[PDB]
């Protein structure tokens, strides 16, 4: 008998393997696991970790946010482990070198028309195997509507969680506990 925590076995949390059985993504994961092991590059380690993540942690990054994040250094290349989506609110693009998992058709067309280029992660591993001049970016991992229902329960004081309701008219979840005139408010 020995008095250890968790009986002496180190416990890790989070993903350990790719779940997607996409052969191309499996090949990419193999390549970047090898790259992360054989080079010291935290760049490659981060990319190898992010290729493994669920969909909700590879959110899209719009063109406007891409070109805003890459404003100050214009000759670098931006690498996103999500998808790049178009932004109709953006009036003009400018000469972006972007590596990404996937591009929507509109975003790809706009980037090539602006004269930049779209890169896959195998091309990124070919040309910048260490990540020189490569800026790691990610989209908003907490903007999705599911997070709007998370956190403190709707009903706890000063809670911002969205409740689960069929509809959102005046007669749905809006009388008692949501205004001072009916018992209390939140």
């Amino acid at each position: 008998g020995i008095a250890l925590k968790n009986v002496g076995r180190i416990k890790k949390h989070g993903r350990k393997h790719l779940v997607s059985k996409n052969p191309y993504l499996r090949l990419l994961v193999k390549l970047y696991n090898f790259l992360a092991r054989r080079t010291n590059a935290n760049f490659n380690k981060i990319i190898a970790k992010r290729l493994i993540m669920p969909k909700r942690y590879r959110p899209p990054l719009s063109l406007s946010k891409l070109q805003y994040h890459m404003a100050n250094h214009p000759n670098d290349i931006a690498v996103v482990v999500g998808s790049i989506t178009d932004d109709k609110r953006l009036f003009s693009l400018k000469q972006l070198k972007v590596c990404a998992l996937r591009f929507t058709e509109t975003a790809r067309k706009r980037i090539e028309d602006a004269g930049g280029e779209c890169l896959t992660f195998d091309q990124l591993a070919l040309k910048y195997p260490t990540g020189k001049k490569c800026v790691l970016l990610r989209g908003p991992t907490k903007a999705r509507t599911a997070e709007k229902h998370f956190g403190k329960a709707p009903g706890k004081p000063k809670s911002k969680a969205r409740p689960y309701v069929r509809s959102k008219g005046r007669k749905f979840e809006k009388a008692r506990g949501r205004r001072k005139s009916r018992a209390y408010k939140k």
Binding site: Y24, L25, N40, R108, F121, D122, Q123, A125, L126
Partner: protein, 52 residues
């Protein structure tokens, strides 16, 4: 020959799948071992280390 017509090249009115774009790939060339053996990343790799 009709495959190009059906899937977007040389479009004709009643044959081409309307507004359909052929799926693109996550990778550009899946020869990951050729990219690994390319000299740019071979120069990038650190020296082989040893196990326990």
């Amino acid at each position: 020959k009709k495959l190009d017509v059906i899937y977007g090249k040389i479009h004709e009115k009643k044959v081409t799948k309307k507004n359909y774009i052929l799926p693109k790939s996550i990778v550009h060339n899946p020869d990951i071992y050729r990219i690994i053996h390319s000299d740019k990343v071979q120069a990038s790799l650190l020296a082989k280390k040893k196990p326990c």
